[model samples]
Structure formats: structure tokens, C-alpha cells
Target: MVLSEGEWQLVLHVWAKVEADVAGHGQDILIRLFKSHPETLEKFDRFKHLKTEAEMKASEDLKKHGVTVLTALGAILKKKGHHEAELKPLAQSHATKHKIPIKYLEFISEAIIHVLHSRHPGNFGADAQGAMNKALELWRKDIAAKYKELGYQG
Candidate 1:
């Protein structure tokens, strides 16, 4: 699971384009997240009533939520040591304070992977996809570790 700095920079270059269309990619991924894990609807007051992917995709609330998620992901993609600082507090507050199930972290990672795949369409080559995979893995691990260290509870 070794990602070179050059590879990381490549990921940043491509992903920035993806991120720039915040609502487009964000809505796509969040819709998938809600559809695959309908139980997650309970966490958000705005989109909880959205029963179909289309409805969820159309909601401005969902779009904003998606932007927020991607922004956090961007922060984590910072230098290695910075990820812990960027992620730990959210893990602590989300898991311990808000009592939001940390399982959603993995679900979001899954949704992002799906987005990565589909966004490539004809395929943007292996380096981008590989970085996306490694990035998501790092995100999942970093958040989970923080949740546990902060004393996760059911």
C-alpha cells in the first residue's frame, strides 16, 4: 500500500477536476450511499424522506452534505501526518458526541469508490484508480483508528 508522492499528486490533479464539479460528483456519490445503505437516511433530517435515488440526487441538502464530505476528504489527502489531525476530531465528535455510527465512514468510502469507477467511464488509466483505492483505504483506516482511540461505543 505504498503510494508515491508523484502518484499522490496525479490523484490530486484528476480529483480536483472531479471536486470542482462539487454537486455533480457529490450528488452522484451520496445518492449511491443513501441507496446502498438506506439505514443511513436516519442520520440526516433533510434527505431522510428521500425514498428514491432520483429524489435524493435532486435535493440541495444532499448536494451540500456531499460537498461537506468531499471537502473533508480533501483535507485528509493532505500530507501523511496531517490526516490524523484532520480526521481525529470528526471521528471523536461524530462517534462519541453525535453518536453517529462510524460504520457510515466505510459506506462513504464504498460510495466514493463507486464514484471513482463510474467517473472514469472509458477509463482514466490505472494510476488514478489506484490512488483512489489507496486514498479511500487510508481514510477508512485513519477514521476507524481515531474512533477507537476516542473510545467508540454502541
Candidate 2:
């Protein structure tokens, strides 16, 4: 993924807008994912029991996991062209240890975009959405490669 200078700038700008509250945004993103696609809740024992939005939002475990995702994604953005170095290990683990369904990778990207759009309508405009989509597509591509490499076809 070769993000043009403007695209990268847009990404960074929108990220900065939400950087101060990654936990809140991340939690919302995850909740958005679970709400839209209830099957995603099955992967996490910690979240599986959360039948209501209120319960899910209040989950400490969910919030913590959201932080983990937010932090790792920030790290990847910081690395830029060297994203594979930062992303591969996590991808490997998600594929192997976590046994994450590959489809959730795409689902989460939508969740992320939705949350950002709702929270930062001005920042997450058409151009910003395009940039974010490209970056997330790259993320999904790399992560899915790991899943395939590990022979987990989900």
C-alpha cells in the first residue's frame, strides 16, 4: 500500500482527532462490530456473554482488548512502509493462537470506519474515508495472508 502524501496526512489528522480517546473509540468500534455482526461475539469468551450494548460497553475485558488494538494500529501507522514488521507478528498470533476468523478482519474495518465517521464527521470526509479504506485494505490483506499461510482458511 502506497498512500499518497495527502492520504497519509489525512489519516494522521483523523487519527490525531481520536488519539486522545482511543479506549472510548476502540470500545465503540468493537461494540459496533458486535452489534452489526453478532457472530463476532463468539470468538471472545469475555464478550460472548455480553448480550446487551450496555453490558458490552461496560466490559473491562472488552475495553482492554480495544486498547490493545488501538495501540497496535497506532504503532503500525507510525511505522508506515514498515507495517509488515509490526503487523505480521500480531497477524500470526491472531491466525494461530487466537484463531480469529478471517472475515472478522474485514468486519472490524467497517466498524472502525463507522465509528470514526459518527464521531468525527468533519474529519472523516470522502477523501479521508478513501485513505482509511486503503490503509485498512492493506491491513486486511496482510493479516489474511497470515491466516492463509497458517492454513487457517476462515
Candidate 3:
């Protein structure tokens, strides 16, 4: 009951708006995440050297990594957010392999939401926001469980 079929559709409806601003929104999300939680930026060696906002925004490494994050989210939406296996490597990599804190999972969700609303205020209304929030709840739960499974307490 976390997300109804209608809500899933609503989420997808707004997510489809990424068609044109994939790079823009992805980078924006990451930048927002970095600004909100500077610790998350340290995990990315490629982007660690970025000292200024303009540098961070202009770097190709940041741009590529940003799209990678969006592509992973797209994969989850494509799978309808039900397949735990879909998140296995992602969680394992971030938690065990990459050593990212679970809190950043929640952080990225906020960043994604922020960028989405900022880019598409008209499309991201009440229903869409509700659906997105529900979807992120499910996402965080799944990943957190996986993180637990892999013994990643942080």
C-alpha cells in the first residue's frame, strides 16, 4: 500500500519530464546534494577537486556521474521499484564497495526531488509530489535493508 498503481503512474508521468533535461537535472541534483551534504561530495574522487560552484557545475566528471545517478533511478522506475535484485549491486557498491553512508541515500532522494520541482514546477504538483515521496520511501527502505544485509551500519 506504499504506492498505488495510480501513484506509480503519476511518478512516472513527472519523471518523463527528464527527457530534455537529463544532464541538467542530474547535475543539478548532485550539486544540490553536495551543497546540502558536503560529505557526499568527498566520496567522488573525480569531483573532489572541485573547489568552486562554477567548477563543480562545469566539470565533465560531475556531469557524467550525475547522469549515471539519473540512469540508475531510471532503472528503478523501469522495474517498478519492486525488484530487490535491481538494487543489490547498487546498495552493495555504495554501502560495502564504495562505503557511502546510508543517510546519503535519503539525501540523494531529497536532491532529486528538489531538482525535479525546480525544473518542472508545473508537472510536479501535489499528486506527483506525494507519489514521488512514497516511491522514495520504498526506495530508501529497500536500500536500507540491503545495507543492513551487507553489514553496513552507517
Candidate 4:
């Protein structure tokens, strides 16, 4: 799938927000994300400030999308008789797009669990891990689908 300029911008715009104003650090997480993923910066530069206000609005939209995806994952896990079956596709999809090895995904999952546990120490448990695994799985699928729909053939 080929992403139109607008679609590409939309994905980057959302990423920008994920790192934007994080805990008032002033340096948007996107700054680091761009540093680690410099190609993203190049894409942002391509747009060249089409409209600052519009772009800011797009960032908010992206954040909303993130929340929506998380919520959906939670809903999926709330049901019964679903386990690895529901998650494998998500993991495979993510592994394909980010070139993230399955092992690395496991590490990422552990890290996320650690962070979440720290934030809600009382909430740390199997259920939390289960939710996180599901979320990660969904994230991979969502990203892969977006990339494909946008024509990222990698």
C-alpha cells in the first residue's frame, strides 16, 4: 500500500504527540524518536510547516487514536476463551513491520510491564501483563496494517 502525503503526515503527527510535551520535559519525545529514527525527521521536514495550528490539531488526533487502540485491546481481552490465538497475528504483524524480532518484542513487553507496575504498583500482576501483551500485539497489527494501507512495502 502507498501512503499519500497526508496519510504519512498523519502517522508522523501522531508519533510526534506520543513524545510531545512528555511530563513537561519540554523536549518532545518525538525529538528522541527522530534521533533514533532519523528518517521520521526527514519526513517531517518534507512537509515544512504547512500550518502550525493544523499540525498541532493533527497531533491531538493522533493521541486520540493511540487511546482508541489501547481501549480496543482491553475490550478484546475482557472476553473469554481467547488467549494466544488472539495475540499471535498481532505479534506477527508487528514483527514484520518494525523488523522487531520476537525476542525483542518479549523484552519490550517486559519493559512495558515494569513501567506500568511502577506506576501502579498495586496493580502489577498477571492480568496487567496479559493486557500489555494484548496491547502490544494489537499495536503491531495496527501498525502493519497502516503501513500496508499507506504503501510501505517493507
Candidate 5:
């Protein structure tokens, strides 16, 4: 699941769109994820009472937090091969502050993946998709390892 430099370039180029303008679709990506995984609502105290994406849309908190997450991920992706540099703190923050299970943190890609596959429409081909997939898959392992060490059983 290793992405070559060229592949990383292609993938990062496409993702730069989302990072450049997360204010526009960050909520869209997150709402899509939340809709797909209803149980995920419980993890966000701000969304605890919100039953659906529609209900949460009116929330400024949801929009701000979703943008924040996407922005962080964008920065991290830009720093390829610096896993211990950025993801270490990110993983620790989730483990300590959010108590986010590795599985759910994996879904952080749901938004970015969706952007690559859907929003950018017709831009990212197999190579780009493969690159993005491998990039995220590697980060998932790194973050999950940190979570596991923090007593995450699964």
C-alpha cells in the first residue's frame, strides 16, 4: 500500500481542493458520514442530541468542528512521510481527549475519500484513488497503533 512520489503528487493535488476551500464542503462531507453512520453521533457531544444531518446542519458548532478536522487532515497529508511528526499528536489527542476508537477515527477519511471520489467529479482516476487510499490506510495503521497502546482493545 505504498504510494509513489508521483502518485502522492496526484493525490495531494486533488486533495488541495478540499483543503483550500473546506469552508464550502467540510460540513457536506461530515454530514454525509454522520448520515451513513448514525451511531457516530454519540461520540460528538455537540451532536449528541442531533438525530440527523439535517438537524445538525443548523449548528455552527458542527460546521466549525468538521472544518477543523478536515483542515488538520489536509495539513498532515501535505507533510508526507512525517508520520511521527504530526500524526503522533493527532493520535494522542484523540485517544486522550475524544476517546475515539481507532475504527471511528478511520472514518476521518470518509470525508476526504468522498471529496476525491465525488466532489472533484471526473478528476481522480484509479491512480489517484489508489494513492489516496494507500496514504490513508497507512495513517490509519499508525493512528490505530497509538490508540491500541492507549488501551484500545479492538
Candidate 6:
């Protein structure tokens, strides 16, 4: 489950995209994710809370880069036939850490997709759910790996 730097960058890029989307709503997606999963808050803070508005700005460039990186990550995982195995732990860990019920995740997913669709009608299309599933899968994997690396496994 070791991820290369490129993989890590893809994860970061996803966050960047989410942040850009959230910024338009006057909410910080990274902060929300951290608050929901407090244990992982510190790991992404540096990038999440960028000091310079220029670097942290959620612009068209940032959103495009984020989507591009995510699409690449998905392609890589697909090529390796490593989709389901890689995502299960992500959903589990996120539910466990945030005490998020499965129903809640489902609702959140639906609501999120609804909003995104409203904003960008044809872009996400049918792949929205699949994309979310993969992203959450990665989140869980990354979190669990960090926990094990930091000796939080018990």
C-alpha cells in the first residue's frame, strides 16, 4: 500500500480541487475534512492553509490541475487492476475515525454530487460516484498508513 510521490501528489491535488470548490462557497473543504477527521489534521495543514493568497487561491488553474491529477491517478489504479482492494480500508477508516455512519457518507455523497452537478452540469457525468468512491478509498488507505507509520496501531 506504499504510495509513490506521484500518488501523494495526486492526493494533494484532489484536496486542492476540493478546496477550490469549497472556497467559492466560503467554506474551506480541507478544514472541514480535518475537523471531521481530526487525527489527520496536522499532516495536510501546511498545504491546506497556505499563507499567500496567490498560492492558496482556488482558481480555474487549481481546479483544472486537481481534476487532471485525479484522472491520472484513477487511470493508474485501473491499469493495475487495484481498485476495490485499495478502497475498502479507506471507507472503513474514515467511518471509524470520524464516527461517520454509512448512511451519513451516502447522504453526503449524494448532496455533494448534486451540488457539483448543478455547478458544472456535464463535466462529472456518470463517473461522479465512481470518482468519490476512489477518493474515499485513497483517504482511508492514506490514513491507515499514516497511523501505522506513526505507531498508532494497537
How does each model score on TM-score? 0.84, 0.93, 0.94, 0.35, 0.88, 0.32
Q: Over all chains combined, what TM-score does candidate 1 have?
A: 0.84
Model 2 C-alpha lDDT per residue in residues 87-121, reported as the tens digit of each score: 77887778887788778888998999999999999
Give the best candidate by TM-score.
3
Task: Give one clash count per candidate, in the order shown.
Answer: 0, 0, 0, 6, 0, 1
* Candidate 4 similarity to native, TM-score: 0.35
Sort by TM-score, best first: what order?
Answer: 3, 2, 5, 1, 4, 6
In candidate 1 the C-alpha lDDT for residue 45 amounts to 74
Worst 10 residues of 4 by lDDT: 24-33
Q: Write the per-residue lDDT of candidate 5 for residues 76-106, one digit (tens) a residue.
A: 7787757567877787778888777766756
Error of 6 at 57 (Å): 13
| Model 5: lDDT to the true structure | 0.75
Off by over 4 Å in 5: none
RMSD of model 3 against the true structure: 1.2
Q: Give the whole-model CA lDDT for all candidates, comma-separated.
A: 0.74, 0.85, 0.84, 0.41, 0.75, 0.44
lDDT minimum window of 10 residues, candidate 5:
145-154
Residue 18 alpha-carbon offset, candidate 5, angstroms = 1.3
- In Å, residue 121's CA in model 4 sits off its true spot by 1.2
Task: Candidate 2: list runs displaced more than 4 Å.
Answer: none
lDDT of 3 by residue, 82-120 (tens): 767789888888887788877888898898888888888
Candidate 2: minimum summed lDDT over ten consecutive residues — where?
A: 78-87
Error of 3 at 46 (Å): 1.9
lDDT of 1 by residue, 85-149 (tens): 77767787788766766578778778877886778644436767777677777766777777777
Q: Give the TM-score of candidate 6.
A: 0.32
Candidate 6: worst-modelled 10 consecutive residues by lDDT: 25-34
Stretches of model 4 off by over 4 angstroms after superposition: 1-62, 80-92, 95-98, 125-154
